[PDB]
Amino acid sequence: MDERDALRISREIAGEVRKAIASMPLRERVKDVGMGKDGTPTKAADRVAEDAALEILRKERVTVVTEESGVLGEGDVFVALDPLDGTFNATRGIPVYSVSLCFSYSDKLKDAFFGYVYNLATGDEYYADSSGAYRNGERIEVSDAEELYCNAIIYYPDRKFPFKRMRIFGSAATELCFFADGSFDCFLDIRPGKMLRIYDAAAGVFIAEKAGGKVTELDGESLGNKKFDMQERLNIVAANEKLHPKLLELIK
Amino acid sequence: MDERDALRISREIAGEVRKAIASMPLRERVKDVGMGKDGTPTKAADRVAEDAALEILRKERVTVVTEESGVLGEGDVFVALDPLDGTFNATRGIPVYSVSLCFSYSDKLKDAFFGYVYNLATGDEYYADSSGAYRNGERIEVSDAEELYCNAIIYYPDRKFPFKRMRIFGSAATELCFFADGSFDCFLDIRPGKMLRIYDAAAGVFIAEKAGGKVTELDGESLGNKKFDMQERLNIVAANEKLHPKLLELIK
Ligand SMILES: N[C@@H](CC(=O)O)C(=O)O
Ligand SMILES: N[C@@H](CC(=O)O)C(=O)O
Ligand SMILES: N[C@@H](CC(=O)O)C(=O)O
Ligand SMILES: N[C@@H](CC(=O)O)C(=O)O
Ligand SMILES: N[C@@H](CC(=O)O)C(=O)O
Ligand SMILES: N[C@@H](CC(=O)O)C(=O)O
Ligand SMILES: N[C@@H](CC(=O)O)C(=O)O
Ligand SMILES: N[C@@H](CC(=O)O)C(=O)O
Ligand SMILES: N[C@@H](CC(=O)O)C(=O)O
Ligand SMILES: N[C@@H](CC(=O)O)C(=O)O
Ligand SMILES: [Mg+2]
Ligand SMILES: [Mg+2]
């Protein structure tokens, strides 16, 4: 499997997940249908999204790591799949939610070869491969902001902060792309519980890095050894190379 | 002028603003075009929006209070107009932004008779009159949540908080509607600088109250004597009757 195959698979999935969710009324979407393997409830929207995705991934030699059904398959290529990221928004008709796919040649983030976040409400498509990062077919990159007085997405502000703006949209996979294309200047998830899971962030990270972002754990350690499993957890500090160290110091 | 005229006018305005913005590329939207009367830059998107609105409102015996052009007209009915709320998102292409109109029989909020917030990205329409509050022609009401462990929209969290979720979308007018239809359990703007302006909040406030929400100033003070002018600033605590007092004590 290569970055071209991945793009093809990722798009086929996006189309199906899009249809499935778009035809589903909010009263249907919001219903609890079971306990996800992640240890949180699967909403009817989650299950519908995941089924459409797994139907397609089933035909590839991959091991799938996915929120609701957990680890599936035996393949050598690993896929961190968030079938629906921002479910809470989706169940309320707030148009920030996505399907996220990160493809890796091992069970570690360092071997990623393809990242893909499709906005299910806007049809916006973000991906990155060896040729860089894209928003709807156009090369994107991160902002060149060097000042803490910038536009930040942050989970969660718990003290006074120097930022010009703070936003929290509820879809890390999508918001990481907002940072990737420069819409925002940095992305922080510094929650002490360490809540983010591999499928939430993997693609977002990969795309942000290809867009020139420096993306690291709370203390600046590499995300390379983050595992494609259900136990993995993440904090994230992501910004351009110059703003990044300033953020690291800001949160000590 | 009554509540029906208001709805008719608001819908006419919404159609024009929505068509104007949808045809406008992001690279055009984001351009600074002048300094607004509020003391912040007018973006090209702001101007296109405001001109569309004013072309329709100028045919009415109203005094208009609007972000970019300021106080206009001589009429006895006052209209707080945010021609584009969430401009930052709109320039981004992030689908949370609205046109907001609140109509009053004086220059104070207490004499409001109509509230209208239209999401320009989704086509969602929120309004309220003497018959209650609506999202897309359906009656809405606020959630009955009694616990601080709830879903909050809050500008800005500056300490540790007991909330289940925190969201900040960048359009107070729209987020006030999210609270109004119960998508969220409360809306808080507790920014010490007192940043909200009359046209950001008036319509949303009116709609929330009609949906059953209790909406006050930082100290439980009434919003009734808030002025339809450029000098007015607001903080907001908005939740149902039960949850509201708890939030009040939480933020002392
Ligand atoms: N995923 C898109 C295709 C694309 O992104 O170009 C679809 O709806 O089929
Ligand atoms: N947005 C909620 C839950 C969800 O989106 O499914 C959260 O993880 O905080
Ligand atoms: N998924 C959310 C839904 C809500 O808070 O309304 C929960 O844990 O309850
Ligand atoms: N999730 C919403 C987005 C919107 O309100 O446009 C829906 O398509 O139902
Ligand atoms: N209007 C905003 C835009 C931005 O922050 O990039 C400003 O203060 O510059
Ligand atoms: N707020 C969400 C964001 C996401 O699901 O990506 C979370 O805590 O996981
Ligand atoms: N403003 C809407 C009218 C409506 O809300 O029914 C439109 O553009 O058609
Ligand atoms: N006024 C918004 C951004 C904008 O719409 O210009 C903020 O400062 O958060
Ligand atoms: N603001 C965006 C909305 C969206 O992406 O759906 C646009 O009109 O391009
Ligand atoms: N989020 C707010 C920012 C402000 O008014 O200061 C708004 O644009 O409605
Ligand atoms: Mg779950
Ligand atoms: Mg302005």
Domain residue spans in chain A?
1-138, 139-252
| Contact yes or no for B6/B103 (Cβ under 8 A) | yes
Residues sharing a CB contact under 8 Å with residue B179, sequence separation 6 or more, in sequence order:
B142, B153, B185, B186, B187, B208, B213, B238, B239
Annotated ligand binding at B68? The verdict is no
Distances (CA, A) of B49 to A45, B99, B242: 35, 8, 38
Choosing from A46, A67, A85 the residue with most ligand 6 atoms within 8 A of its CB, the one to mutate for a pocket test is A85
Mutate to test the interface with A, among B140, B156, B190 (most CBs of A within 10 A): B156
Tokens standing for residue A42: 């699967």
Is the distance from the beta carbon of residue B164 to the nearest atom of ligand 2 less than 6 Å? no
Ligand 2 atom at minimum distance from A97 CA: 5
* CB-CB neighbors (< 8 A) of B94 in chain A: 96, 169, 178, 183
Is the distance from the beta carbon of residue A36 to the nearest atom of ligand 2 less than 6 Å? no
Which residue's CA lies nearest to atom 6 of ligand 6?
A172
Is the distance from the beta carbon of residue B143 to the nearest atom of ligand 3 less than 6 Å? no
Ligand 6 atom at minimum distance from A200 CA: 6
* DSSP E strands, chain A: 32-35, 41-43, 62-66, 70-72, 77-85, 98-104, 112-119, 125-129, 132-135, 138-139, 151-155, 165-167, 186-189, 214-216, 236-239
- The three-point CA angle A18-A21-A27 to 5° equals 165
Pairing between β-strand B132-135 and β-strand B138-139 as defined by DSSP bridges: antiparallel
Ligand 8 atom at minimum distance from B97 CA: 5
State the Cα–Cα distance between residues B214 and A150, nearest whole angstrom: 34
Which residue's CA lies nearest to atom 8 of ligand 3?
A41
Name the nearest CA neighbour of A17 among A46, A71, A53, A44.
A53
Which H, E and C letters describe chain B, residue by residue?
CCHHHHHHHHHHHHHHHHHHHHCCCHHHHCCEEEECCCCCEEEHHHHHHHHHHHHHHCCCCEEEEECCCEEECCCCEEEEEEEEECHHHHHHCCCCCEEEEEEECCCEHHHEEEEEEEECCCCCEEEEECCEEEECCEECCCCCCCCCCCEEEEECCCCCCCCCEEEECCCHHHHHHHHHCCCCCEEEECCCCCCEEHHHHHHHHHHHHHCCCEEECCCCCCCCCCECCCCCEECEEEECCCHHHHHHHHCC
State the Cα–Cα distance between residues B47 and A245, nearest whole angstrom: 38
Does B1-138 carry CATH code 3.40.1410.10?
no
Ligand nearest the Cα atom of residue B13:
7
Strand partners, A108: A227
Strand partners, B133: B128
Name the nearest CA neighbour of B161 among B147, B175, B174.
B147
Ligand nearest the Cα atom of residue A126:
1
The binding site of A for Mg(2+) comprises 38, 40, 67, 82, 84-85, 200
* CB-CB neighbors (< 8 A) of A121 in chain B: 95
Distances (CA, A) of B223 to B59, B71, B109, B169, B235: 29, 20, 7, 23, 9
Distances (CA, A) of B109 to B79, B102, B181: 10, 9, 21
| Contact yes or no for A113/A104 (Cβ under 8 A) | yes
Name the nearest CA neighbour of B146 among B238, B26, B51, B244.
B244
Question: What fold does the segment set A139-252 form as a domain?
Answer: D-Maltodextrin-Binding Protein; domain 2 (3.40.190)
* CB-CB neighbors (< 8 A) of A158 in chain B: 157-161
Ligand 8 atom at minimum distance from B84 CA: 5
Q: Do B94 and A170 touch (CB under 8 A)?
A: no
Locate the chain B residue with the closest alpha carbon to A151: B88
Mutate to test the interface with B, among A168, A176, A178, A187 (most CBs of B within 10 A): A168
Q: Do A124 and B93 touch (CB under 8 A)?
A: yes
Q: Do B165 and A160 touch (CB under 8 A)?
A: no
Q: Do B157 and A160 touch (CB under 8 A)?
A: no
- How far apart are the CA of A237 and the nearest CA of chain B, in angstroms? 19
Residue with tokens 């101007």, as numbered in its chain? B47
Helix, strand or coil, per DSSP, at residue A17: helix
In the reported structure, the alpha carbon of residue B102 is separated from the centroid of ligand 12 by a whole-number distance in angstroms of 18
Q: Which residues line ligand 10 (CB under 6 A)?
A: B 85-86, 170-172, 195-196, 200
